[PDB]
Write a protein that binds this ligand. Structure first.
Ligand code: NI
Length: 341
């Protein structure tokens, strides 16, 4: 049964709740972003309204094959009425097309649902700054003080330098980047751009990217592998056995792979900086793990929440155990007591 944290009080609106069958009472299913835990259940045989961003719209139409009539795309930063309730979509700073939703209830209650987000100070000068938010449905993926990681800009700077050095030392080296969903496109586009290449990828991954409204994208990507010295692979395939395999397939055009695995947090964040990173090396294949996050660090989350000063916080991540639930409530109480709300 659909959990209470996927339902919006006093509306017939649900958020990211496509895997339960029909939810009784629901006039409208919101989708925050095209990631599979959130969309799970959507297919060509959905005949209820889905509201989402334009980009998420393109992905539902072309990858899942949902029929045009059930997809309602909304623009961002625009007051819109949806079944007689004012709503706003705001950039979540997560993956392409990912949004937060502002709900203005008839009773006067204002509710913010973050979907998945990476909190940023630029959000403090958006439409959010204009009025009080009473209820916050919060992405708590990294709600614990151990979770630190660098800025996205720091990580891209590292990647660009690594790749450029290695290719300028050895012009027959190949850069591979791992992938499994949308998200983190800056990693491979930054590398490609320093190296004067397009990025080469399978037909399914090329199709996924052509839905994202990226500017000049036709100049940045291709399905012709041979012509490209930055390649995308399934993240499953980023290991020595699978890379070796792939190094064969190129047919004596490259002698060395330099690969990146953009991970979330890993326990080596607790003891090592970004300037001091090292790969695993089995011959001519090296594999970097780089902690490029599209979720809030603990301190980023804490700051956005202490600015917002919400009357109530409902977690949407790590809610399946009583220990996580209890631990999270503790942080919300400290935050509130520190900040005086
Ligand atoms: Ni996500």
């Amino acid at each position: 049964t659909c959990p209470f944290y996927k339902k919006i009080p006093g509306t017939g609106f649900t958020v990211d709740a496509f895997q339960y069958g029909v939810v009784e009472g629901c006039t409208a299913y919101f989708l925050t972003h095209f990631h599979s835990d959130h969309y799970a259940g959507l297919s060509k045989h959905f005949t209820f309204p889905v509201y989402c961003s334009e980009i998420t719209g393109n992905l539902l139409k072309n990858k899942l094959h949902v029929q045009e009539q059930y997809i309602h795309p909304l623009p961002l930063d625009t007051e819109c009425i949806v079944n007689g309730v004012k709503v706003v979509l705001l950039d979540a700073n997560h993956c392409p097309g990912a949004v937060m939703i502002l709900f203005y209830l008839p009773n006067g209650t204002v509710i913010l649902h973050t979907g998945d987000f990476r909190a940023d100070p630029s959000m403090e000068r958006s439409l959010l700054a204009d009025q009080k938010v009473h209820m916050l449905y919060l992405d708590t993926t990294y709600c614990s003080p151990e979770y630190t990681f660098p800025s996205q800009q720091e990580v891209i700077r590292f990647a660009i330098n690594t790749a450029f050095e290695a290719v300028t030392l050895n012009p027959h080296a190949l850069v591979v980047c791992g992938t499994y969903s949308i998200g983190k496109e800056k990693v491979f586009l930054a590398i490609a751009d320093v190296l004067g290449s397009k990025v080469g990828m399978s037909q399914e991954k090329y199709k996924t990217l052509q839905c994202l409204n990226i500017p000049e994208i036709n100049s940045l990507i291709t399905t012709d592998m041979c012509s490209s010295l930055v390649h995308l692979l399934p993240m499953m395939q980023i290991n020595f056995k699978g890379l070796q395999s792939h190094l064969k397939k190129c047919g004596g055009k490259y002698n060395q792979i330099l690969a990146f695995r953009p991970t979330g947090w890993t326990h080596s964040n607790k003891f090592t900086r970004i300037a001091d990173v090292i790969p695993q090396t089995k011959g001519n294949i090296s594999i970097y793990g780089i902690p490029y996050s599209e979720h809030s660090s603990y301190l980023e989350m804490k700051r956005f929440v202490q600015w917002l000063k919400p009357q109530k916080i409902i977690p949407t991540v790590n809610v399946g155990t009583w220990k996580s639930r209890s631990t999270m409530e503790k942080y919300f109480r400290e935050w509130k007591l520190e900040a005086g709300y």
